[PDB]
Amino acid sequence: GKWYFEVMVDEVVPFLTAQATHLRVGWALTEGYSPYPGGGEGWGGNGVGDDLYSYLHLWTGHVARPVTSPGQHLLAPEDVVSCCLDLSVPSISFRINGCPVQGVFEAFNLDGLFFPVVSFSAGVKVRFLLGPIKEYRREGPRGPHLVGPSRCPPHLERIREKLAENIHELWALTRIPERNYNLQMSGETLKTLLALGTPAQTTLVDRLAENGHNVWARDRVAQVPYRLLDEATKRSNRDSLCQAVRTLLGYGRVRIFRAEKSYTVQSGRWYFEFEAVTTGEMRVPELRPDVELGADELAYVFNGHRGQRWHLGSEPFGRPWQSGDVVGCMDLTENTIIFTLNGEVLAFREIEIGDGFLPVCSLGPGQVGHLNLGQDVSSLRFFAICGLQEGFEPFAINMQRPVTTWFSKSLPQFEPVPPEHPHYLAHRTWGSQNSLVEMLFLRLSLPVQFYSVRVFACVWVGWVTPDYHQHDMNFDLSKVTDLVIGCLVGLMTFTANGKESNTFFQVEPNTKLFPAVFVLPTHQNVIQFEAAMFLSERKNPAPQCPPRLEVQMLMPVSWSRMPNHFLQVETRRAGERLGWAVQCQDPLTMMALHIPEENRCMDILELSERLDLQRFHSHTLRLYRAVCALGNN
Amino acid sequence: ARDPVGGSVEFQFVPVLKLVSTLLVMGIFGDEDVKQILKMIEPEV
Amino acid sequence: CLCAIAGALNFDPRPVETLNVIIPEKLDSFINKFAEYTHEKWAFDKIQNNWSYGENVDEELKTHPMLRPYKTFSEKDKEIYRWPIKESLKAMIAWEWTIEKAREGEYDPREGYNPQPPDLSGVTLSRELQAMAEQLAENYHNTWGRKKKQELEAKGGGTHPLLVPYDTLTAKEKARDREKAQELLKFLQMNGYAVTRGYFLSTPAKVLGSGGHASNKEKEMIFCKLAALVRHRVSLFGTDAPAVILARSLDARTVMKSGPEIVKASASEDIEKMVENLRLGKTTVALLPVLTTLFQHIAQHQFLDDVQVSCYRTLCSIYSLGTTVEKLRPALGECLARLAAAAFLEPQLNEYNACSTLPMLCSYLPRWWERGPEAPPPALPAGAPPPCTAVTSDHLNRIIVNNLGIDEATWMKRLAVSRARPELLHSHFIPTIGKRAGKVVAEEEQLRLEAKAEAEELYALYPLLIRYVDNNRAHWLTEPNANAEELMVGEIFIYWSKSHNFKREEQNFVVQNEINNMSFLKSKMAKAGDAQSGGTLKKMLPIGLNMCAPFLQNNLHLQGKVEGSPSLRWQ
């Protein structure tokens, strides 16, 4: 219900680099915060969320807001934020040093667990005061691991009764209207047996106990699932159930990791070794960053556990995968994908060629391992003899700099799409129909700063924020054939259901509303789009009375596409609790530049990976150089 | 070593050579710096 | 073929009675209700198409006249509802599907009779009725289909969808009559009348088979032959099925075995079936059968051959047991006795398969065998001993080291046919269970022997070469596995290599090898050896160049090898 805690921050120099460090506290539910070191929208932060609630001036939606305090300054080595949150009526609200520093929260939702998040920018150390945030990249003894991602009849009755009294007495001996109460308890047991209608029976009994235990817990609360309660309790419950049983007898999701395209190998024989810091089943240019893994024309792999490799298809050829077990895969010149297990060699016969390929490693939730990579030290297991016999040399000397691999990531973006899904004035509206699932969503490509819609064809519509993109999901309105268009100089609505809903919500300070909606299901799409104010907005030129059509149109979905590559270091200090204060040292600088889309974090490496963006950037650079020409001031 | 600073050995060098030329033209270089550049060339003498 | 397919997994419309059956008054009572209910439904359904009451037949305009309320009716308009109903109930009366009276009791609109019928869905088939809707849908379609059939029987055409077996038809077509049939019986129970008479496929097949099989056994004891062919088909089906009652099925299997066992007390089919049964194997009656075989075996030892062959096959079951007790101890004891008393090689193999304080006697026998080392005079006892050693190793999981030493001694003795092959299998098992230096010394001793044989080498030489090829290959394979496990070996490899070169270059030898293969029914080893030898890159390149042209001594040796590798490549 109520919870409160205190964390005191240690000695952070506010400036190294031209940055005012990061070190904002707030709180957050699991869902919808999924930090990345790539950095979010608007050039990435905390309190960005409609998740994050963090705390200075304001944080919320990634839109700082001023706040009354008495220190009226940023946290520094001196202080102790003094955190508080109620859940019940849910308000986080805050103090520092017991000093009121104003009221905030309420009006969002229950769901998930709203823990405390601490952000450190630079060199800083802090105590937390009580008595990872996900992560593809791990943490390893030799070569970083890499793991994730984890979501976490009457006669019978008489027999029962008489048997029950005996049981109560037997139980009584061990301890050293009452039974009676014992008989009533036996009767309950009978009800449980009726509900139930070999070890599985024992498990069922334990489950029933938890369920009854659960009702008991509810009663106590009025005054956690049994797996949740814990193993010792479960074991104790199991024993009683077992005694009862003797008496009865008597009575009679997946993350894919990729390599840079530049590394690409188009010829020869090479070897890649995968290291497992995780035990489980995993599969080892064209393949999509995001999509089904291991069952496609794009690549060939088999689950370690299964002793099966997707052709894509079904096959055996191997011992079941063992945690912390060496694996070895081996040629451009021939055409095989030999698999050496522990080397300890197990391959594929006759394979197409060109466009290189490399092998892609995708890890499903909860196992980490590290896959390598460079140096002789690297041959491990090994996994060395084969290289010696194989002559399929490791990347070795080439790629002296450490290799970099793009990451699938977590959050979809409302990207452009063309001819996809097959089967994907005005007119504007279109869509593709096949055996299309819902969906919807839609989105648009015009930005408003700080006037018509047609459709018809039931479906939620609203207008989406620049940061509106978020995981979808069922998306039933609202979670945080008449078409009415609302124009904002104001209140945005339109004429709901053809005829007025009235006016629902509006912000007039200077945000910036993006229009689409999401439409889902049906044999025929029947969607029609379009513009006065909208036309004026879209073009710097105008507004003009005549309707205008953009060179560009927008779409198509956030998608669930993974493509951002990871980085160089991300070392800090962790951050040990017991003592209660964690200190982080060093500095990180991001060369990435924000788009006018806008606010996405570019990641320079990402730009390098994407040529079209790169081409545009290069052209821009040339133009800039050109303006400079002639030595003009 | 399978390089590539730029995937173009030449691109990387051009970037460096141009900077060097600009510096030499500028003449904002130490005599010791000049000696270092000469050594850098091949150390013929 | 059909059976294999199942494993992978033209008319006569019955004549009911529909006027020979004249409704009891309780059915007349349901007829007022059900018929009235039907009229109401018509208003409800005809009103759904916007139809209405009028006073005349404006059927296109969405109007009846008969959409006069159920109360308004002339009974003759009610007969449009009563007739289908009367046919329904009468059909039931015809089947003696008695309809016991407990109770008779029952959108863009317009005009009409707009009743709301006590909806049909709202009651659903009791288990009596769950059987009934199937036959009413079956029967109703037939009467309709029989009228359709009289219509078809008038017209001289091709095939009738409802005039072709009803079940072939989509469940959706089957639905149309059901839409009459469920509509009757559920509605009857809804009106307070029951209508009362008066994977899984694999399990069913197995049961039917057990049911027949017993019949067949009875027949054997006393068209029967044709069914027996069916038995072979069934056995094939069973093998496919497994992989795809289990214990119960096995018990049935025991009965089949008893029948076959009795016969032992079409031969190939039974054997295949037995083998399949054996394949299947991979109760008290079974224990008894085993005991009989043991006793039977003892009798055979004292003095049928078919029974004996069957018993050997029973050996396969033991292997199956291996994959996954008094009678067993006893029969087992008889087996041990037979072994002591000791086609003989085959019997020994069967005994070993079956085998697959007490530890002490075995240890003493083992010590005796070790004593046995350096001399033999008995091919059969040694094989039995090897099987026993394998069983002991299995029981164990030191002792393993002793077993390995024993194996080495055995190899030495061998160095000093079918028995040889059995020995080889035992050796492979021993190697798997698996000192190394001693093995290497032994190999050096052998390899040298092989080299000598090569130097010596017409047909006899080829046969000797073939013998050298089998043992050398096997023991060699185990040795290679050991070397990999612990990866001088280069020297051993070089020797193997010389032999390999002679082998690549052997015509009479090649023919001998082919003959040996044929009788049964070295490249991999050579490759492993080559890898070991490869185990100085520039020097290697120079050597390769020299080979193409074809420590200094070592280099020359490497070059010679390279030539061997080239020969191998040429293949």
A497: left (phi over 0), alpha (psi -120 to 50) or beta: left
DSSP 3-state percent helix, strand, coil across chain C (nearest 5)? 75, 0, 25
Q: Do A388 and C487 touch (CB under 8 A)?
A: no
Q: Residue A189 and residue A332: Cα distance in Å, rounded?
A: 68
Q: In angstroms, what CA-CA distances link A519 with A298, A423, A526, A527?
A: 31, 15, 10, 9
CB-side neighbour CA atoms (13 Å) of C85: 22
Is C446 exposed, middle or buried, given 0-12, 13-18 or 19+ CB atoms closer than 10 A?
buried
C-beta of residue A331 within 8 angstroms of C-beta of residue A268: yes
B1 touches chain A (CB under 8 A): yes
CB atoms within 10 A of CB B27: 7
CB atoms within 10 A of CB A628: 9
Residues of A with Cβ-Cβ distance to C534 under 8 angstroms: 388-389
Q: Residue C310 and residue C312: Cα distance in Å, rounded?
A: 5
* Radius of gyration of the CA atoms of chain A, in A: 31
Structure tokens at C5: 């397919």
Helices (H), A270-402: 385-390
Shortest Cα distance, chain A CAs vs residue C487, angstroms: 9
Q: In angstroms, what CA-CA distances link A97 with A4, A71, A83, A90, A406?
A: 13, 10, 9, 22, 44
Q: In angstroms, what CA-CA distances link A55 with A5, A76, A84, C324?
A: 14, 14, 12, 64
Residues of A with Cβ-Cβ distance to B7 under 8 angstroms: 262
- List the chains bordering chain C where 3 or more Cβ pairs fall under 8 Å: A
Q: How many residues does chain A have?
A: 633
C-beta of residue C388 within 8 angstroms of C-beta of residue C429: no
Of A277, A275, A255, the closest CA to residue A136 belongs to A255
Structure tokens at A194: 């009726």
- List the chains bordering chain B where 3 or more Cβ pairs fall under 8 Å: A
DSSP string, A174-201: HH--TTTHHHHHHHHHHHHHHHH--HHH
Structure tokens at A448: 């408003």
Q: Residue C500 and residue C509: Cα distance in Å, rounded?
A: 12
Shortest Cα distance, chain A CAs vs residue B7, angstroms: 8
- Closest-CA residue in chain A for B1? A398
C-beta of residue C495 within 8 angstroms of C-beta of residue C451: yes
β-bridge mates for residue A100, sequence order: A95
C-beta of residue C549 within 8 angstroms of C-beta of residue C559: no
C-beta of residue A307 within 8 angstroms of C-beta of residue A282: no
Q: Is the dihedral of CA C271, C274, C278, C283 positive or negative?
A: negative
Residues of A with Cβ-Cβ distance to C531 under 8 angstroms: 385, 389
Backbone angles phi, psi at C373, to 5 degrees: -55, 140
- Closest-CA residue in chain B for A262? B7
Helices (H), C303-433: 305-323, 328-341, 345-355, 358-371, 379-383, 385-396, 399-415, 420-433
Please name the residues in contact with C359: beta carbons below 8 A apart, sequence gap of 6 or more.
C392, C395
Residues of C with Cβ-Cβ distance to A388 under 8 angstroms: 534-535
Q: How many residues does chain B have?
A: 45
Shortest Cα distance, chain C CAs vs residue A385, angstroms: 8
Core vs surface per residue C140-176: b (16+ CB within 10 A) or e: bbbbbbbebbeebeeeeeeebebbeebeebeeeebeb
Q: Do chains A and C touch (3 or more CB pairs under 8 A)?
A: yes
Q: Do B2 and A262 touch (CB under 8 A)?
A: no
Query: A-B interface: how many C-beta pairs under 8 angstroms?
Result: 11
For testing contact with chain C, the best of A338, A385, A392, A397 (most C CBs within 10 A): A385
Of A338, A334, A356, A354, the closest CA to residue A346 belongs to A338
A265 touches chain B (CB under 8 A): no
Backbone angles phi, psi at A552, to 5 degrees: -100, 150
B32 touches chain A (CB under 8 A): no
Q: Is A29 helix (H, G, I), strand (E, B) or coil?
A: strand
Q: How many residues does chain C have?
A: 571
Of C96, C105, C102, C92, the closest CA to residue C34 belongs to C105
Please give the helix or strand (H or E) that residue A247 lies within, else none.
Answer: helix A231-251
Place of tokens 């007969």: C79
C-beta of residue A588 within 8 angstroms of C-beta of residue A570: yes
C-beta of residue C187 within 8 angstroms of C-beta of residue C34: yes
Helices (H), C191-327: 202-221, 224-240, 246-264, 267-281, 284-302, 305-323
Q: Is the dihedral of CA A222, A228, A232, A236 positive or negative?
A: positive
Of C371, C372, C444, C442, the closest CA to residue C412 belongs to C442
Report DSSP state, residue A443.
-
CA angle (C229, C231, C236) in 5-degree steps: 105
Q: In angstroms, what CA-CA distances link C56 with A242, A265, B11, C62, C370?
A: 78, 86, 95, 11, 114
Q: Residue A47 and residue A27: Cα distance in Å, rounded?
A: 9
Query: A-C interface: how many C-beta pairs under 8 angstroms?
Result: 8
Q: Residue A263 and residue A261: Cα distance in Å, rounded?
A: 5
Q: Is A215 helix (H, G, I), strand (E, B) or coil?
A: helix
Q: Residue A138 and residue A141: Cα distance in Å, rounded?
A: 10
Q: State the pairing for strand pair A339-341/A327-329.
A: antiparallel
Q: Residue C215 and residue C224: Cα distance in Å, rounded?
A: 10
CB atoms within 10 A of CB C217: 17
C-beta of residue C277 within 8 angstroms of C-beta of residue C316: no
Q: Residue A281 and residue A283: Cα distance in Å, rounded?
A: 7
Please name the residues in contact with A141: beta carbons below 8 A apart, sequence gap of 6 or more.
none
For testing contact with chain B, the best of A261, A270, A398, A404 (most B CBs within 10 A): A398
- Give chain B's largest Cα–Cα span: 36
Report DSSP state, residue A563.
-
Q: In angstroms, what CA-CA distances link B42 with A7, A52, B36?
A: 60, 59, 11
Please name the residues in contact with A223: beta carbons below 8 A apart, sequence gap of 6 or more.
none
C-beta of residue A562 within 8 angstroms of C-beta of residue A289: yes
CB-side neighbour CA atoms (13 Å) of C490: 7
B30 touches chain A (CB under 8 A): no
Structure tokens at C408: 């080495």
Q: State the pairing for strand pair A370-372/A406-407.
A: unpaired
Structure tokens at C363: 């240890």
Q: Residue C464 and residue C73: Cα distance in Å, rounded?
A: 109
C156: left (phi over 0), alpha (psi -120 to 50) or beta: left
Of A391, A608, C541, A395, the closest CA to residue B1 belongs to A395
For A404-427, the three-class secondary structure string (H helix, E strand, C coil) is CCEECCCCCCCECCCCCCCCCCCC
Helices (H), C101-126: none
Report DSSP state, residue C82.
H
Q: Do B1 and A397 touch (CB under 8 A)?
A: yes
Q: In angstroms, what CA-CA distances link C217 with C213, C221, C286, C311?
A: 6, 6, 17, 20
β-bridge mates for residue A557, sequence order: A415
Core vs surface per residue C179-188: b (16+ CB within 10 A) or e: ebbbbbbbbb
Q: Residue C196 and residue C180: Cα distance in Å, rounded?
A: 18
Strand segments, DSSP code E, in A34-86 are: 52-54, 80-86
- Closest-CA residue in chain A for C527? A389
Q: Do A399 and B2 touch (CB under 8 A)?
A: yes
Q: Is A16 helix (H, G, I), strand (E, B) or coil?
A: coil
Of A12, A46, A5, the closest CA to residue A128 belongs to A5
Q: Residue C550 and residue C562: Cα distance in Å, rounded?
A: 10
Of A383, A304, A313, the closest CA to residue A348 belongs to A313
Interface of A with C in 364-393 (CB under 8 A): 385, 388-389
Cis peptide before A157 (omega within 30 of 0): no
C-beta of residue C235 within 8 angstroms of C-beta of residue C276: yes
Q: In angstroms, what CA-CA distances link A380 with A400, B1, C567?
A: 19, 22, 33
Q: In angstroms, what CA-CA distances link C59 with C37, C39, C49, C63, C80?
A: 21, 16, 11, 5, 15
Cis peptide before C243 (omega within 30 of 0): yes
Structure tokens at C496: 């193997």
Q: Do A389 and C534 touch (CB under 8 A)?
A: yes
Of C145, C143, C127, the closest CA to residue C197 belongs to C127
Of A293, A362, A408, the closest CA to residue A36 belongs to A408
CB atoms within 10 A of CB A584: 22
Q: Do A389 and C535 touch (CB under 8 A)?
A: yes
Of A126, A8, A145, the closest CA to residue A576 belongs to A126
Structure tokens at A353: 């060629």
* Solving technique: cryo-EM
Resolution at which this structure was determined, Å: 4.9
- Closest-CA residue in chain A for B7? A262
CB-side neighbour CA atoms (13 Å) of C99: 31
β-bridge mates for residue A584, sequence order: A124
Shortest Cα distance, chain C CAs vs residue A285, angstroms: 33
Q: Is the dihedral of CA A600, A604, A608, A609 positive or negative?
A: negative
First to last CA, chain C: 44
Of A349, A330, A350, the closest CA to residue A390 belongs to A330
CB-side neighbour CA atoms (13 Å) of A523: 0
Q: Do A385 and C531 touch (CB under 8 A)?
A: yes
C-beta of residue A608 within 8 angstroms of C-beta of residue A618: no
C-beta of residue A117 within 8 angstroms of C-beta of residue A46: yes
Q: Residue A470 and residue A493: Cα distance in Å, rounded?
A: 22
CA A539 remoteness from chain centre: 36
Is A72 exposed, middle or buried, given 0-12, 13-18 or 19+ CB atoms closer than 10 A?
exposed
Backbone angles phi, psi at C538, to 5 degrees: -65, -40
- Give chain A's largest Cα–Cα span: 107
Report DSSP state, residue A340.
E
